[PDB]
Amino acid sequence: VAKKILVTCALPYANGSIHLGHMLEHIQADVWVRYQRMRGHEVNFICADDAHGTPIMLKAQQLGITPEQMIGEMSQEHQTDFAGFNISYDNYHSTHSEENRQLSELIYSRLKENGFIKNRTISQLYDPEKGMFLPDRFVKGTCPKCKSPDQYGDNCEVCGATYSPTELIEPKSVVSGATPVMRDSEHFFFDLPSFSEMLQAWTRSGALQEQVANKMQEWFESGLQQWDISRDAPYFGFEIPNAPGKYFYVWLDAPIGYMGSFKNLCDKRGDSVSFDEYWKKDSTAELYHFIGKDIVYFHSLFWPAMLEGSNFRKPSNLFVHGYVTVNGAKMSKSRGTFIKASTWLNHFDADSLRYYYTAKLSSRIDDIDLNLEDFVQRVNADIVNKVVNLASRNAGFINKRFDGVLASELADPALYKTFTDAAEVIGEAWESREFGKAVREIMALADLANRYVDEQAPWVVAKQAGRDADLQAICSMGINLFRVLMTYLKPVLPKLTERAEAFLNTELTWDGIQQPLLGHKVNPFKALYNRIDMRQVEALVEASKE
Ligand SMILES: [Zn+2]
Numbered sequence: 001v002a003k004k005i006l007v008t009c010a011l012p013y014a015n016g017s018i019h020l021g022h023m024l025e026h027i028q029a030d031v032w033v034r035y036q037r038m039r040g041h042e043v044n045f046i047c048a049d050d051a052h053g054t055p056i057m058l059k060a061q062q063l064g065i066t067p068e069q070m071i072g073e074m075s076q077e078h079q080t081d082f083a084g085f086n087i088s089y090d091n092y093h094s095t096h097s098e099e100n101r102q103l104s105e106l107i108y109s110r111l112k113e114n115g116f117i118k119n120r121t122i123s124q125l126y127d128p129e130k131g132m133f134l135p136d137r138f139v140k141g142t143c144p145k146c147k148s149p150d151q152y153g154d155n156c157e158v159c160g161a162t163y164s165p166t167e168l169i170e171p172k173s174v175v176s177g178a179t180p181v182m183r184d185s186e187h188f189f190f191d192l193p194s195f196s197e198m199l200q201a202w203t204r205s206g207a208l209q210e211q212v213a214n215k216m217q218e219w220f221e222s223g224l225q226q227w228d229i230s231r232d233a234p235y236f237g238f239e240i241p242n243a244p245g246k247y248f249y250v251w252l253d254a255p256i257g258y259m260g261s262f263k264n265l266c267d268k269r270g271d272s273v274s275f276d277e278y279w280k281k282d283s284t285a286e287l288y289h290f291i292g293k294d295i296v297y298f299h300s301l302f303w304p305a306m307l308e309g310s311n312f313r314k315p316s317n318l319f320v321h322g323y324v325t326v327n328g329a330k331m332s333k334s335r336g337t338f339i340k341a342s343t344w345l346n347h348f349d350a351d352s353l354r355y356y357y358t359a360k361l362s363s364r365i366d367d368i369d370l371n372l373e374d375f376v377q378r379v380n381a382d383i384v385n386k387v388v389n390l391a392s393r394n395a396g397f398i399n400k401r402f403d404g405v406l407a408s409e410l411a412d413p414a415l416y417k418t419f420t421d422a423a424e425v426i427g428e429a430w431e432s433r434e435f436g437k438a439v440r441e442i443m444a445l446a447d448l449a450n451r452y453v454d455e456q457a458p459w460v461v462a463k464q465a466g467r468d469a470d471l472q473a474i475c476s477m478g479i480n481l482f483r484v485l486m487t488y489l490k491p492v493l494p495k496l497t498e499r500a501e502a503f504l505n506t507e508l509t510w511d512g513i514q515q516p517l518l519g520h521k522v523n524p525f526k527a528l529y530n531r532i533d534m535r536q537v538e539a540l541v542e543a544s545k546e
Helices: 020-038 054-063 066-083 099-115 193-204 209-222 250-270 274-279 295-311 341-347 352-359 373-400 414-422 424-432 435-454 468-489 494-504 535-546
Strands: 004-009 042-049 090-093 117-127 139-142 169-173 181-188 230-232 246-248 286-292 319-322 322-324 368-370
Touching: 004 020, 004 250, 004 274, 004 435, 020 042, 020 066, 020 286, 020 319, 020 322, 020 341, 020 352, 042 066, 042 250, 054 066, 066 090, 066 341, 090 099, 090 250, 099 117, 099 250, 099 295, 117 169, 181 230, 181 295, 193 209, 209 295, 246 250, 246 468, 250 295, 250 352, 286 295, 295 319, 295 468, 319 435, 341 535, 352 373, 352 435, 352 494, 373 435, 373 468, 373 494, 373 535, 414 424, 414 435, 414 468, 424 435, 468 494
Parallel strands: 004 042, 004 286, 042 090, 286 319, 322 368
Antiparallel strands: 117 181, 139 169, 230 246
């Protein structure tokens, strides 16, 4: 029937700009969400900025502005980039909100009551001048192995040795320049180990990608550990109830952002029933998290345990994707392959990237390679020469010789059925996240549509006397095939689809393809998409280098 679906994307860190690596996740989720909406389901697409943490607090101080101001600006920047790529979020919030505070306290309270919170005193390097414990990377020093100066954290970039910051020669606090010292502090831990049996049964209930369920097996074998969920002041975040000086570490408050953002959305809509409908233990609504492979452990073990422990429903499934490489290698700042979302939009449109990523995506966790050379060729070849060409080639004749009126019947009903029959396969491909497959199927159909037009040679029929009817039937057949193709691609290319709809004078819906456009008036044709040059790509890389 009509499902209730809540989809999220991992929360971007407020202390950084969105790059093409991040876009892969958001575009993958958006394509899936747009398809689900097209099928009539109730979909809620949610996200938010991860805005707490010592790093955030320090960068803000270093800059002279308040963290509240810093994260506020980063939030607008991120939202501008996502809007630019047409990521159709129903709501984009922040972990730094009243909703998140309330939910973090509620969940913490329940976990504590149920006895899943443990106290443990730990020892950590402390900056006595600033009065704050120091995370490993905030301690500078001389490597005890090779004696190289200015080595940070727990590893040396020179000899590559690893060690505890307490082994550094002349340790110095990066925050004040003071010499750190050891110091004790009581911390709160989440008893993840007490959920192992439940998590095992849950993971075995056939949900996760084969590759995910397999990594989980190794994690169980190794054994689960308790996780620290507290931090000491000074800190930028929410204070733990009944624990003055203690704050919620990100492990806890970041994923709550998924809930906080949804609650914020319900409040905005004046909806007092949905939150519980979606998050209560016996919910029949579906919850999906689109995440990267680097945060699977957290979302598959810690997150569901926390939810279970606080009496909330667990995710229905986790959709994991791999990383993005450019030209076969990790993004490179020196090579100008480290491309930011905002930079990309200064040179190309969002539809091009959305199409390329989609054509390469699948239900597997494999890495996605953005080959710039291949990108230009794929876009020009597929979008411009196969799909858009189908419309432009036939639009002229219809607009100039028939007043934009399409024929009253299908020239080839059998060929049309071939295109609508494919809906089943393409729809299941979109649904199962086999995007590359959906695109292959669609392009196969596009080749077919172009072959039909080639064989009918309208530019030839257009020259023969007493063949006006034939010309109209042929060109109208081509426009109707284009109608179907654009429908299958609607989830992928939002802007191109709008321009297509303006031309066809119709809104494209999934079920609408069963009813071809007959005796229908299309609008004067206008370039739907233009070819891109390799020079455009070179300018982007140069711009990224700089
Ligand atoms: Zn060294």
